Write a protein that binds this ligand. Sequence first.
Ligand SMILES: Nc1ncnc2c1ncn2[C@@H]1O[C@H](COP(=O)(O)OP(=O)(O)CP(=O)(O)O)[C@@H](O)[C@H]1O
Ligand SMILES: [Mg+2]
Ligand SMILES: [Mg+2]
Length: 349
Amino acid sequence: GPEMVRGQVFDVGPRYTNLSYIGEGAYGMVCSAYDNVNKVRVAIKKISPFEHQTYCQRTLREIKILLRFRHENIIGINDIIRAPTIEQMKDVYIVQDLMETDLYKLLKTQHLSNDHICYFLYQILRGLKYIHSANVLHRDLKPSNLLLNTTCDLKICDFGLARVADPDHDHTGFLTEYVATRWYRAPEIMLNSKGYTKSIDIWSVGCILAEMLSNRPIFPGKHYLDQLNHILGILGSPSQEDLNCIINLKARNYLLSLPHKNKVPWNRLFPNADSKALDLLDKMLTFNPHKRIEVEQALAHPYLEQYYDPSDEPIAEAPFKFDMELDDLPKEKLKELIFEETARFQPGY
Ligand SMILES: Nc1ncnc2c1ncn2[C@@H]1O[C@H](COP(=O)(O)OP(=O)(O)CP(=O)(O)O)[C@@H](O)[C@H]1O
Ligand SMILES: [Mg+2]
Ligand SMILES: [Mg+2]
């Protein structure tokens, strides 16, 4: 029968063989495999979303976005395997280039030189420039979603929480709550849970930069509200100006009830870090999202001056627009759209 990895069927043969476990998640599993047609090794992400509406919604977004993107610092889709009929489609298999490791794993076994930190950060922001220019928010940037090779090429993966937010329309009040992984969650995800912006991805990049400098997460909260206390424990209490910018009255009143905390200087937390890196970290980990540095300005910061070149940093040819955001649909309909969207890889097409 078809190959198995840790009790999970991977119905991908005969093209793809020699399956080995790489990782997993809430409704999927990732393996390495050998592509017998192209004579290369690939990654295969099995995704099983069809029992739940939210999983279907996210799977359609991930597939649509990754198929349209083409960029050196974003993982591509090479192939998609699924059953020839919608009644038989229980799973979707996304075939991608195999990368050697991710940044989470690298940081467990290795302290990184400034040279490497600098190069990785450049690549994260070059990809994010492309993602933001497409009017996409990633919303789950963290070390385990950054893939790395031995040549230090970096690719952003895991667009499972990603979405489109067309800036022609005010999205305040319509965005999903509780996005990102806790430690990489900007303050406004807690204080403005339905009206945050792409600025949340810059915060996550800041957290990643911090983690590359010390090999430990900067804001390791244990639960929703504790995360915010960890943030304020380093940044200090927000100024009155930054409080006045918080539109939600009960979030602003909640902050006004908290005890005063002083700013911990960056050089005290990272005494051996390059000074330009800390200046950039500061601007990324700025409490007020309106004052927080944007991706293009971050690329032009002096820390990345040896790599910055806007003639070699593509933006999206065709940005996503509002029409394709209308995906709050029953799971049966989402399955049909996923079936349609993956048809370009079927023999019959
Ligand atoms: N193309 C690839 N090459 C090598 N490793 C990969 C890969 N794609 C994913 N991985 C590895 O598998 C892990 C899980 O992949 P991914 O994050 O896409 O799955 P997932 O979305 O189900 C987990 P979650 O939903 O919690 O983010 C990654 O952290 C990474 O280590
Ligand atoms: Mg992930
Ligand atoms: Mg994911």
